[PDB]
Design an enzyme around this catalytic site. Structure first.
Site, PDB file in Angstrom:
ATOM      1  CG  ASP A  74       3.698  -4.897 -13.418  1.00 56.31           C
ATOM      2  OD1 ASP A  74       2.601  -5.668 -13.958  1.00 56.31           O
ATOM      3  OD2 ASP A  74       2.942  -3.695 -13.155  1.00 56.31           O
ATOM      4  CG  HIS A 130      -0.214  -4.530 -12.559  1.00 61.85           C
ATOM      5  ND1 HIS A 130       0.526  -3.426 -13.347  1.00 61.85           N
ATOM      6  CD2 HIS A 130      -1.617  -4.133 -12.822  1.00 61.85           C
ATOM      7  CE1 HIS A 130      -0.316  -2.588 -13.970  1.00 61.85           C
ATOM      8  NE2 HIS A 130      -1.520  -2.982 -13.799  1.00 61.85           N
ATOM      9  CB  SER A 184      -2.599  -0.206 -14.775  1.00 61.16           C
ATOM     10  OG  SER A 184      -2.381  -1.193 -15.769  1.00 61.16           O
TER      11      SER A 184
HETATM   12  P1  LIG Z   1      -3.839  -2.047 -16.275  1.00 56.90           P
HETATM   13  O1  LIG Z   1      -4.934  -0.885 -16.738  1.00 56.90           O
HETATM   14  C1  LIG Z   1      -4.530  -2.834 -14.537  1.00 56.90           C
HETATM   15  C2  LIG Z   1      -5.802  -3.700 -15.200  1.00 56.90           C
HETATM   16  C3  LIG Z   1      -5.656  -4.979 -14.764  1.00 56.90           C
HETATM   17  N1  LIG Z   1      -5.031  -5.823 -15.950  1.00 56.90           N
HETATM   18  N2  LIG Z   1      -5.857  -5.912 -16.616  1.00 56.90           N
HETATM   19  N3  LIG Z   1      -6.673  -6.253 -17.640  1.00 56.90           N
HETATM   20  O2  LIG Z   1      -3.272  -2.891 -17.259  1.00 56.90           O
HETATM   21  C4  LIG Z   1      -3.491  -2.255 -18.493  1.00 56.90           C
HETATM   22  C5  LIG Z   1      -3.190  -3.604 -19.504  1.00 56.90           C
HETATM   23  C6  LIG Z   1      -4.249  -4.558 -19.366  1.00 56.90           C
HETATM   24  C7  LIG Z   1      -3.514  -5.770 -19.298  1.00 56.90           C
HETATM   25  C8  LIG Z   1      -3.102  -6.214 -20.503  1.00 56.90           C
HETATM   26  C9  LIG Z   1      -2.777  -7.942 -20.640  1.00 56.90           C
HETATM   27  C10 LIG Z   1      -3.776  -8.227 -21.770  1.00 56.90           C
HETATM   28  C11 LIG Z   1      -3.558  -9.470 -22.500  1.00 56.90           C
HETATM   29  C12 LIG Z   1      -4.723 -10.107 -23.392  1.00 56.90           C
HETATM   30  C13 LIG Z   1      -4.457  -9.760 -24.835  1.00 56.90           C
HETATM   31  C14 LIG Z   1      -5.427 -10.681 -25.553  1.00 56.90           C
HETATM   32  C15 LIG Z   1      -5.001 -12.214 -25.298  1.00 56.90           C
HETATM   33  C16 LIG Z   1      -6.075 -13.200 -25.215  1.00 56.90           C
HETATM   34  C17 LIG Z   1      -6.084 -14.193 -26.373  1.00 56.90           C
END
Ligand SMILES: *[P@](=O)(CCCN=[N+]=[N-])OCCCCCCCCCCCCCC
EC number: 3.1.1.23
Length: 248
Positions: A195, A225, A96
Site C-alpha cells: 500500500d 491501496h 481507507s
Molecule cells: P483513503 O481514504 C483512500 C483515498 C485515496 N487517497 N487519497 N487521498 O486514504 C486516506 C488518507 C488520504 C491519503 C493520505 C495522503 C495525503 C498526503 C498529503 C498531505 C499534504 C501534502 C501536500 C504538501
C-alpha cells in the site's frame, strides 16, 4: 449542500434483503464506486446492504471543502440507522478512511456484530510531512495518484484535495486511534503488503489497539491501496462472506 451533480457510479447503493446487514464505507475523496462490487456480492448472498455516499464526496472537490469529519460520520450514521430498521445483526466494512469510519462506528456502537476494515488509516505521517515543509500550503492540493496493481482499473476520486479536508481527516484519525480500545467486536483486518497510500503498519496499530478477543490480519499480496477493486477483490469478498456467516 453539494452544488455539483453526483458523478455517474458515485450514487449511494441500497439493497433490502435478509435480517443481517452490511454497511460499506468508501474513502477520503473517494466514492461508492470503490465499494460497489463488494456491496453487490453481499446483497446477492442475502445480506441487506447500505453503501452511502459521504457528504461532499462524488460531486466536486469544492463541495468537499465545506464538510467536516462530523459530516462524514453523519453519512455513515444515516446508513447504520437505515440498516437498524431492517436488520437485527449488522457488520461494517470500509476502505481507507472508510476503514477509519468503520473503527469509529464500532467505538461508538457495541451492538455492531463485527468489522472488516480494509487498508484502514489511523496514522498517515505524510500529512504532517506536508504541513511542516515550511512552504505556503495551497488551498487545494493535487491529489495522490490512484494506487492500484491492476493497470486497467481507475478509481473514481477527486483530482484535487482540499487542505481543509486533509486537516479534518487528520483529526478524525487522531480521535479514532485514541479510542481503539473501546472496540471489542470480532475484527477481520485486510492490509495490502504494497500500500503506497496508507502505511501497512496501520493494520498492526489497529490489531494491537483494539480490545477484541477475535481478531485477525489478512495480508493482500496482489493489491495496492484500492484493494476492493484490485486483484485480491474475490478473496476479500470470499473471506468477508465467511466472516459474516461465522458471526451471523
Ligand atoms: P483513503 O481514504 C483512500 C483515498 C485515496 N487517497 N487519497 N487521498 O486514504 C486516506 C488518507 C488520504 C491519503 C493520505 C495522503 C495525503 C498526503 C498529503 C498531505 C499534504 C501534502 C501536500 C504538501
Amino acid at each position: 449542500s453539494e452544488q455539483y451533480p453526483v458523478l455517474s457510479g458515485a450514487e449511494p447503493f441500497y439493497a433490502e434483503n435478509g435480517p443481517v446487514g452490511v454497511l460499506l464505507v468508501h474513502g477520503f475523496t473517494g466514492t461508492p464506486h470503490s465499494m460497489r462490487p463488494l456491496a453487490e456480492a453481499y446483497a446477492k448472498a442475502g445480506y441487506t446492504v447500505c453503501l452511502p455516499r459521504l457528504k461532499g464526496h462524488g460531486t466536486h472537490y469544492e463541495d468537499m471543502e465545506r464538510t467536516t469529519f462530523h459530516d462524514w460520520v453523519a453519512s455513515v450514521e444515516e446508513g447504520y440507522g437505515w440498516l437498524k430498521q431492517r436488520c437485527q445483526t449488522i457488520f461494517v466494512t470500509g476502505l481507507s478512511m472508510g476503514g477509519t469510519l468503520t473503527l469509529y462506528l464500532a467505538e461508538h456502537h457495541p451492538d455492531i456484530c463485527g468489522i472488516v476494515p480494509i487498508n484502514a488509516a489511523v496514522d498517515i505521517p505524510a500529512i504532517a510531512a506536508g504541513m511542516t515543509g515550511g512552504g505556503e500550503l495551497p488551498r487545494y492540493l493535487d491529489s495522490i495518484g490512484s494506487d492500484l496493481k491492476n493497470p486497467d482499473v481507475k478509481e473514481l476520486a477527486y483530482e484535487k484535495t482540499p487542505t481543509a479536508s486533509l486537516l479534518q481527516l487528520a483529526r478524525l484519525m487522531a480521535q479514532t486511534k485514541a479510542k481503539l480500545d473501546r472496540i471489542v467486536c470480532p475484527a477481520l483486518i485486510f492490509v495490502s503488503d504494497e500500500d503506497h497510500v496508507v502505511p501497512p503498519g496501520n493494520a498492526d496499530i489497529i490489531f494491537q489497539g483494539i480490545s477484541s478477543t477475535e481478531k485477525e490480519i489478512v495480508r493482500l499480496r496482489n493489491s495496492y491501496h484500492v484493494a476492493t477493486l484490485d486483484y485480491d477483490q474475490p478473496m476479500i469478498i470470499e473471506r468477508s462472506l465467511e466472516f459474516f456467516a461465522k458471526h451471523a
